[PDB]
A paper describes a structure:
Cellular entry is achieved by the homotrimeric S mediated virus-receptor engagement through the receptor binding domain (RBD) followed by virus-host membrane fusion. The S1 subunit binds the host cell receptor, while the S2 subunit mediates fusion of the viral membrane with the host cell membrane. Hinge-like movements of the RBD give rise to two distinct conformational states referred to as the “close” and “open”, where close corresponds to the receptor-inaccessible state and open corresponds to the receptor-accessible state, which is supposed to be metastable. We reported a potent therapeutic antibody H014, which can cross-neutralize SARS-CoV-2 and SARS-CoV infections by blocking attachment of the virus to the host cell.
Interestingly, structure of the completely closed (state 4) SARS-CoV-2 S trimer without any Fab bound was also observed during 3D classification of the cryo-EM data, albeit in the presence of excessive Fab, suggesting that the binding sites of H014 are exposed through protein “breathing” followed by a stochastic RBD movement. The overall structure of SARS-CoV-2 S trimer resembles those of SARS-CoV and other coronaviruses. Each monomer of the S protein is composed of two functional subunits. The four domains within S1 include N-terminal domain (NTD), RBD and two subdomains (SD1 and SD2) where the latter are positioned adjacent to the S1/S2 cleavage site. Our structures together with previously reported coronavirus S structures, not including human coronavirus HKU1 (20), have observed the breathing of the S1 subunit, that mediates the transition between “close” and “open” conformation.
Residue numbers in the entry:
A (entry chain B): 726 to 827, 848 to 1064
B (entry chain A): 920 to 1147
C (entry chain A): 641 to 676, 689 to 725
Write the structure that this text describes.
Amino acid sequence: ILPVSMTKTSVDCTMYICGDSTECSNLLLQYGSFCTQLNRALTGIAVEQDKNTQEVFAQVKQIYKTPPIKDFGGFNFSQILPDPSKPSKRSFIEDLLFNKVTAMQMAYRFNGLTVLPPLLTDEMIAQYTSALLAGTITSGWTFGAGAALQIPFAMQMAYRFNGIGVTQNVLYENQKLIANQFNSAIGKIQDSLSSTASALGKLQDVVNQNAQALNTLVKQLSSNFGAISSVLNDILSRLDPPEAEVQIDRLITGRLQSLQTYVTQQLIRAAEIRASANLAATKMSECVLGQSKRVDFCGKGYHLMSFPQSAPHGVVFLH
Amino acid sequence: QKLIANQFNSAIGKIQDSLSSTASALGKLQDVVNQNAQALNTLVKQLSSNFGAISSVLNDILSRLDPPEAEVQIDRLITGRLQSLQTYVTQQLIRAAEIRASANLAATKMSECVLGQSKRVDFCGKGYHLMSFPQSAPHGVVFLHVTYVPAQEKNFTTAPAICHDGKAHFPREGVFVSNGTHWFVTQRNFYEPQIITTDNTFVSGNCDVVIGIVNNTVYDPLQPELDS
Amino acid sequence: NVFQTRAGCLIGAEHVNNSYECDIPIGAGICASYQTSQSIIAYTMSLGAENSVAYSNNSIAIPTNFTISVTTE
Ligand SMILES: *[C@@H]1O[C@H](CO)[C@@H](O[C@@H]2O[C@H](CO)[C@@H](O)[C@H](O)[C@H]2NC(C)=O)[C@H](O)[C@H]1NC(C)=O
Ligand SMILES: *[C@@H]1O[C@H](CO)[C@@H](O[C@@H]2O[C@H](CO)[C@@H](O)[C@H](O)[C@H]2NC(C)=O)[C@H](O)[C@H]1NC(C)=O
Ligand SMILES: *[C@@H]1O[C@H](CO)[C@@H](O[C@@H]2O[C@H](CO)[C@@H](O)[C@H](O)[C@H]2NC(C)=O)[C@H](O)[C@H]1NC(C)=O
Ligand SMILES: *[C@@H]1O[C@H](CO)[C@@H](O[C@@H]2O[C@H](CO)[C@@H](O)[C@H](O)[C@H]2NC(C)=O)[C@H](O)[C@H]1NC(C)=O
Ligand SMILES: *[C@@H]1O[C@H](CO)[C@@H](O[C@@H]2O[C@H](CO)[C@@H](O)[C@H](O)[C@H]2NC(C)=O)[C@H](O)[C@H]1NC(C)=O
Ligand SMILES: *[C@@H]1O[C@H](CO)[C@@H](O)[C@H](O)[C@H]1NC(C)=O
Ligand SMILES: *[C@@H]1O[C@H](CO)[C@@H](O)[C@H](O)[C@H]1NC(C)=O
Ligand SMILES: *[C@@H]1O[C@H](CO)[C@@H](O)[C@H](O)[C@H]1NC(C)=O
């Protein structure tokens, strides 16, 4: 399991610092481009948050669809292939995942800390991971090397053994024995996903970091920073413009700094992700679309194929 | 070889136009330059901010005030400016880690792509990979990945195996194909059908196991020799 | 002339059913573009052409010919 994109955030710095107040908002202009260079930082994040989801999931130029009649030789893919019944069209296993990953946002937009929507819907991501999977099944591994080429699936596993040094005469003789072992293996994933909350603990932390970083960024409004009171509207009602300058500029310089701390946290955290969205984009090319000769890159043991499955703000491979 | 010469020499021909006619070609590199000139330019405009001081020109306050009061005013400029560098540096260290991550991916290719041949799919570019040509660029590097992409297709009926005497013949490398009459073995990624012989295939098991095996005759090179 | 997205209420762009490559991304799978008397349009992003790969258990497709393509990374 890998994180891919992190929650796209955007801060309104004029509104967070001086809440809806004229006497204060004028003062924030002296500090100048601080406000305007944050949103240049939080935009550079939110742009590559689309680039990550772009590079990982869509490496394929066309969207393939699963052929209706399934003879794979006993391999039962119904689990990982899309289900038309659900209102959103997503494979059975993805649904087990979206249930794991999960006022609060009413007190975030009031201050400025908003959440932009991701470019690609959770629905569209499910159409890619249907194609990639539908290419891997039918077309072999060549659909990423060019136009897809259909191949009998049971003959594909005969190749993917010739990679790991098991001569293909082992497959066809064992095909039924492998069908049972494969179809049962996919059977165990369901329980390990559904019965264990720590399954997505990577992704659930990627979400619990932002909701932790934004929530803390709102509590920062409660700090005096040496000012006589933390409510911007008290000081203005309680003091003259001459003295409020001394008091307010202690709040601004404090709050405006509490964003530059938040942004600096994101840029770092968004580099942590941009490093994981490469490892996810590297697998997706070298693991799903190919066969990986790299030991323990695609998981313990000799590697045959991988099945991508979308997850909230992340991706889940079945190796 | 000649057919590839024309296809290769023409491929390099197209790169020129795609480079010269499209400004977005280097848009990665041109942004790497446009970030610093954007970060430094902003770092100069920061000198125009009052930070709560009575005026933003350091030489005004000193001319306009005593040393006792200027301490109160100047230390608002310093603490502001000195912070506006710690913001700039923090931006660079992050941005220079973004690059240090890309200069590894460029150093990894240069070893595993140019100097070798990469078995890693879509690491060295879409399609099977042959070689890469590094080309310098300002504050960057530009690879020319020469890749092998199959083109024309034909539907072939295939079978995993062949019953000859009941021994199941499997291909050493390649698969069995049929144009509808004759069964041929051919290599996967290019169509070069050869006649099925005991030296194109190897023997394993029997016909009571394999699923999908088809009947045929497997030509034997030896039989016509001893028949001589 | 007010279109509704999943991202939010959009104003000033005619909705278009013709899904193209994303030009100006917006959010929740909507992309806007100035291509069209001209005006701004907005439409559901296209993922690329849909292609059914004909699949059957006895059939394989082996390429008879190739091209050498040079790509710039
Ligand atoms: C693939 O496996 C699934 C479940 O492992 C099969 O679906 C089940 O089919 C039985 C009937 O034999 C029903 O009683 C169950 O309710 C079904 N379960 C689910 C989750 O749908 C499916 O038939 C198998 N397909 C193939 C081709 O073997
Ligand atoms: C290889 O191992 C598999 C299981 O790992 C064996 O298949 C099992 O055989 C026993 C009979 O002794 C059955 O009770 C199980 O149901 C089988 N499992 C499956 C998944 O089919 C198989 O027999 C072993 N083969 C050899 C040659 O030892
Ligand atoms: C393989 O494809 C190449 C082109 O992709 C073919 O070469 C072309 O052949 C036509 C004749 O029909 C000429 O007009 C072109 O000038 C050729 N192109 C080049 C670059 O030489 C080639 O004939 C094909 N080979 C097979 C066996 O189909
Ligand atoms: C399938 O390919 C085989 C081999 O090329 C064809 O058999 C040959 O056909 C040619 C005429 O097309 C004859 O001159 C040869 O004598 C045949 N070979 C033998 C060993 O008899 C066959 O005709 C092809 N069939 C189809 C449907 O394409
Ligand atoms: C390929 O030929 C073999 C014989 O060379 C066929 O084997 C026959 O199978 C049936 C069904 O079990 C038996 O009743 C016959 O006795 C077998 N023939 C012999 C000579 O033993 C085989 O069926 C053929 N392939 C297919 C797909 O039918
Ligand atoms: C192979 O058969 C399928 C069956 O529908 C067809 O769509 C496809 O075009 C055929 N291949 C070629 C090269 O025409
Ligand atoms: C291929 O599928 C057909 C049904 O379309 C079936 O009759 C045949 O036995 C299958 N062959 C193999 C090898 O799976
Ligand atoms: C899109 O097409 C449907 C039917 O194809 C039509 O009812 C609908 O009005 C179209 N959308 C717009 C914005 O015209």
